[PDB]
Amino acid sequence: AVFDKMWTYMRSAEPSVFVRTTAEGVARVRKSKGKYAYLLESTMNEYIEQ
Amino acid sequence: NKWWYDKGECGEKTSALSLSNVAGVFYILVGGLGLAMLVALIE
Amino acid sequence: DRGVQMLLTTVGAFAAFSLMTIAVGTDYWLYSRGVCKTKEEVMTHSGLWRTCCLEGNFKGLCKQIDHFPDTAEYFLRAVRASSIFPILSVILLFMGGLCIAASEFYKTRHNIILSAGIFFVSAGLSNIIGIIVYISANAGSYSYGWSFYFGALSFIIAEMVGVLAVHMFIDRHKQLRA
């Protein structure tokens, strides 16, 4: 349920939630004050956090 | 459910208190000042 | 001293009247972000009567604010439309000026100075009611312009001059009883 709902939202989102690269995704989640979240691999997420 | 809700496009901090929801007490205050002036002048 | 007090009262009265008259005729009350001309949102002047535009494709254009695009709301809408209270403030300040002018001539009456005091105080009260009505009418970002603060400064000066007039009348009756 939960993940499918998130998928449906992301496909049905305007402007574009998706990104073309990890670097731009991190840059965007930084750009939005708290208005963006990024779903990515745990290891990469921890590394970016550090 | 799927086509009415699963495709559903749909499902704050307290604000400072504005001059509009204490305006009445200001009106009463100025009215009372006017009334007081009138009474003093009558006396 | 009596001479200095009278001069200061007269100057204050003139300053208050000038300030309020400028404020009630000028347009820089509310730096909101509205529409210069309709029937693209940009900065505006939005005075008491005409909402000139600014910083848009076309500047300087002014149109009379659309008053009246709930009887409780209807009465407030009507009172803001006429701006009776700002205008009544101006009138009362003018009448107080007339009283102070008649002070020097046809003097020894002692009750026209009291009249000036009462008119100035009443002008201040009218001004404060007007400010509240205006600010309430616009609750349906922004900033306030120099004409609004001209109105505010008018209120403070009017109250000071009223205090001066009342104190001066008291001094006159104190001298008379001695």
Ligand SMILES: CCCCCCCCCCCCCCCC(=O)O
């Ligand atoms: C009992 C006397 C107290 C007097 C207090 C005086 C304080 C004055 C401070 C003025 C701040 C104005 C801020 C401007 C805001 C705006 O309109 O953008």
